[PDB]
Amino acid sequence: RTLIVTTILEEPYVMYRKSDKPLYGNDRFEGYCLDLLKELSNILGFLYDVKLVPDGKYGAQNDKGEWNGMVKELIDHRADLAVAPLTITYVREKVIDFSKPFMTLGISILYRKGTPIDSADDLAKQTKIEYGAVRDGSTMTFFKKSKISTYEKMWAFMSSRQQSALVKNSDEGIQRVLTTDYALLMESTSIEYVTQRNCNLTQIGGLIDSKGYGVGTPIGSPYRDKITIAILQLQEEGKLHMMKEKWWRGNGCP
Amino acid sequence: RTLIVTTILEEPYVMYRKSDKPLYGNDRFEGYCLDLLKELSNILGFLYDVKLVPDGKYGAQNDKGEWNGMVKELIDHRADLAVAPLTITYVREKVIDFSKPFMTLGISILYRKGTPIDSADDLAKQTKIEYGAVRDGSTMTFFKKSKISTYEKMWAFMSSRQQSALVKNSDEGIQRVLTTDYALLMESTSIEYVTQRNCNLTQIGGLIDSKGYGVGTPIGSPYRDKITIAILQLQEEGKLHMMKEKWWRGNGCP
Numbered sequence: 001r002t003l004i005v006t007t008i009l010e011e012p013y014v015m016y017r018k019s020d021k022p023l024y025g026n027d028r029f030e031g032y033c034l035d036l037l038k039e040l041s042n043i044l045g046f047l048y049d050v051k052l053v054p055d056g057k058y059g060a061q062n063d064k065g066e067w068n069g070m071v072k073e074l075i076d077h078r079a080d081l082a083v084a085p086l087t088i089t090y091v092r093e094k095v096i097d098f099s100k101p102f103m104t105l106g107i108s109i110l111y112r113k114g115t116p117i118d119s120a121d122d123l124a125k126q127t128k129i130e131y132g133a134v135r136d137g138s139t140m141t142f143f144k145k146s147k148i149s150t151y152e153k154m155w156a157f158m159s160s161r162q163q164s165a166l167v168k169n170s171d172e173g174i175q176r177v178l179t180t181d182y183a184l185l186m187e188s189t190s191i192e193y194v195t196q197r198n199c200n201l202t203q204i205g206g207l208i209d210s211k212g213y214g215v216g217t218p219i220g221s222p223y224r225d226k227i228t229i230a231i232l233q234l235q236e237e238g239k240l241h242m243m244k245e246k247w248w249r250g251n252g253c254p
Numbered sequence: 255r256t257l258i259v260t261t262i263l264e265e266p267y268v269m270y271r272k273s274d275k276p277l278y279g280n281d282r283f284e285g286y287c288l289d290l291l292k293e294l295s296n297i298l299g300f301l302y303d304v305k306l307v308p309d310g311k312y313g314a315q316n317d318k319g320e321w322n323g324m325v326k327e328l329i330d331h332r333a334d335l336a337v338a339p340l341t342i343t344y345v346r347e348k349v350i351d352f353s354k355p356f357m358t359l360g361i362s363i364l365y366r367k368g369t370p371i372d373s374a375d376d377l378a379k380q381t382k383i384e385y386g387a388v389r390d391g392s393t394m395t396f397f398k399k400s401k402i403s404t405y406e407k408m409w410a411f412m413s414s415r416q417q418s419a420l421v422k423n424s425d426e427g428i429q430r431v432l433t434t435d436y437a438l439l440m441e442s443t444s445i446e447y448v449t450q451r452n453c454n455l456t457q458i459g460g461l462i463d464s465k466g467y468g469v470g471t472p473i474g475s476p477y478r479d480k481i482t483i484a485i486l487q488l489q490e491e492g493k494l495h496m497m498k499e500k501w502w503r504g505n506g507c508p
C-alpha cells in the first residue's frame with residue numbers, strides 16, 4: 001500500500017535537498033522527518049507519497065471552529081499520515097489521532113547570550129525587551145489559554161498593539177531576536193537547533209511545559225497504533241536519538 | 255458503575271496515608287497517582303475503587319510468555335485502569351493501551367556525592383564500583399536488550415554471579431547505594447525524589463534514554479482516548495507540574 005503523507009517545510013525536519021538539477025517526488029526532501037518516515041516504512045512495510053500541505057499551515061481553529069493545515073488534511077481524509085513537528089495538544093487530539101511522541105520538548109525562550117534575563121517571569125515583569133511567539137501556533141495557544149498569572153501577563157503583552165510582538169514563522173522570529181531587542185517563545189527542540197548555529201543566541205530558563213510531537217492520522221485510523229509501536233521500537237533501540245544528533249549537531253561554538 | 259483501578263505502592267506515587275485508626279477503601283492511599291486519579295475522575299465523571307495489584311508486580315513476561323502484575327490485571331479485565339509509574343514500553347504497548355504520558359523521564363544513575371564518576375561510561379569501564387538495577391523492571395530490560403556497546407558491557411556485569419548486582423526493589427537498591435560501593439540505574443523521576451531526601455546521594459550524568467509513564471487500559475477500552483485528552487488538559491493547565499512539585503519537594507538537602 002502507498003500512504004499519502006502530508007508535511008510542511010521546517011528545518012531540520014523537512015527541507016529541500018541540494019542538487020544540480022530539478023528534483024521530483026520524494027527525492028525533493030530530506031530531514032529528520034524523512035529519516036523517520038523511512039524507518040517507519042521499513043518496520044511496518046508501506047510505501048509513501050510525501051505532499052506539502054497546500055496552505056502551508058500546521059493546524060489551528062478559526063472563530064467558527066473550522067480547522068486548516070495538516071490537521072484539516074487529516075480530518076478530510078486527504079492524507080493517511082502527517083509527519084512533521086506537529087505538537088500533540090488537547091485541541092488537536094479532539095479532532096485527529098496522534099501516535100505516541102517521537103520527540104519530547106517544551107516551550108522555552110530564545111534570546112541573546114550575556115543578558116540579565118533568566119526566566120519568563122523576568123520578561124513578564126518588564127516592557128522594554130519585546131517578546132512573542134509564532135502567530136496561531138501551539139506556543140501562542142498555550143499563552144492565550146493559560147490562567148497562570150505570569151503567562152496571563154505575557155499574553156496581555158503579546159496580544160497588545162494588534163499582536164505586533166508576534167511573528168508569522170520561526171525564521172522571522174529568529175531574525176527579530178538577532179537584530180533587535182526581542183525574545184522568542186519557541187519549542188525547545190527548535191531552540192537547540194538554532195543555538196547550535198547561532199553562537200550569540202541561547203535558551204533562557206528551562207522548559208515551561210512538557211509535550212511531544214507525534215505522527216497524526218485521521219480519527220479511527222489503524223496505522224495510529226502500529227506507528228506507536230514502531231516509534232517505541234526506534235526509541236528503545238537508540239535510533240531516534242541517533243537521528244536527532246545527525247540533524248541537530250552544528251559546526252561548534254567558538 | 256465504578257471503575258476498578260489497579261495500582262501498586264511506590265513513593266511518592268501511591269503510599270499508605272498516616273492515621274491513628276485502621277483505614278479502608280480509597281482512604282488508605284495518598285500520593286501523586288491518587289491526585290491524578292481524582293483529577294481524571296472529575297474531568298471524565300467516573301467513580302473508582304483503588305485495588306493494589308495482588309502479586310505486587312508492574313508487568314513482565316514469564317517464559318511461557320504469560321503476563322503478570324498490573325499489565326495482566328488489565329489483559330484479564332480485572333481492572334479498568336492502571337494508575338502507577340508504569341513505564342510505556344514496546345513490549346507492554348503490544349498487550350495493553352497506554353494513555354499519552356503524564357510524566358516523561360529517563361534512566362539515569364543514583365550514586366554517592368563527591369566522587370569522580372561522571373557517566374555510565376565511567377561505570378562500564380571499571381569493576382571496583384558495583385552497579386545494577388531493579389530485577390525484571392523496564393530499566394533491566396533496557397540493558398538486557400541494548401545493542402549499544404557500553405550498555406552491553408554493563409549488562410554483562412549486571413548478570414554475573416546469577417544477577418547478584420540486581421535488587422528486588424528500589425528501597426533495597428537505595429540502601430545498597432547508601433551502605434556499600436554501589437550505583438543504582440534508576441528512573442530519573444525516582445532519583446529526583448530520593449536525592450531530595452537523602453543528602454549524601456546524587457544523580458550521575460543525565461538521562462540515557464527517554465520514555466514516559468502512562469495510564470494503562472485494556473486493549474479496546476472506551477476510556478483510553480478520553481484519558482489521553484484529560485491528561486493533555488491537565489498538562490496544558492499546569493496541573494501536572496503543580497502535582498509533581500507537591501509530591502517531590504523535600505526541605506532537607508543539600
Ligand SMILES: C=C(C)[C@H]1CN[C@H](C(=O)O)[C@H]1CC(=O)O
Pocket residue numbers: 010058085086087133134136137138139140169170185186187
Ligand atoms: C514551526 C511551528 C510554526 C510549529 C511547530 N510545532 C508547533 C505546532 O505544531 O503548533 C508550532 C511552533 C510553535 O507554536 O512554537
Ligand SMILES: C=C(C)[C@H]1CN[C@H](C(=O)O)[C@H]1CC(=O)O
Pocket residue numbers: 264312339340341387388390391392393394423424439440441
Ligand atoms: C518501581 C519499579 C519496579 C518500576 C517503575 N517503572 C518501571 C517499570 O514500570 O518497569 C520500574 C522501575 C525500573 O525498572 O527502573
Ligand SMILES: [Cl-]
Pocket residue numbers: 098099100228352353354482
Ligand atoms: Cl496513544
Ligand SMILES: [Cs+]
Pocket residue numbers: 019020021022
Ligand atoms: Cs538547483
Ligand SMILES: [Cs+]
Pocket residue numbers: 041042045046047
Ligand atoms: Cs518500505
Ligand SMILES: [Cs+]
Pocket residue numbers: 093094095096097098219479
Ligand atoms: Cs483522538
Ligand SMILES: [Cs+]
Pocket residue numbers: 114115116117118204
Ligand atoms: Cs541569563
Ligand SMILES: [Cs+]
Pocket residue numbers: 147148149152
Ligand atoms: Cs491567575
Ligand SMILES: [Cs+]
Pocket residue numbers: 178179
Ligand atoms: Cs546582531
Ligand SMILES: [Cs+]
Pocket residue numbers: 295296299300301
Ligand atoms: Cs468523580
Ligand SMILES: [Cs+]
Pocket residue numbers: 279280301302303
Ligand atoms: Cs469509592
Ligand SMILES: [Cs+]
Pocket residue numbers: 225347348349350351352473
Ligand atoms: Cs495497543
Ligand SMILES: [Cs+]
Pocket residue numbers: 370371372376
Ligand atoms: Cs571521570
Ligand SMILES: [Cs+]
Pocket residue numbers: 368369370371372
Ligand atoms: Cs561526579
Ligand SMILES: [Cs+]
Pocket residue numbers: 401402403
Ligand atoms: Cs554493538
Ligand SMILES: [Cs+]
Pocket residue numbers: 450507508
Ligand atoms: Cs535541594
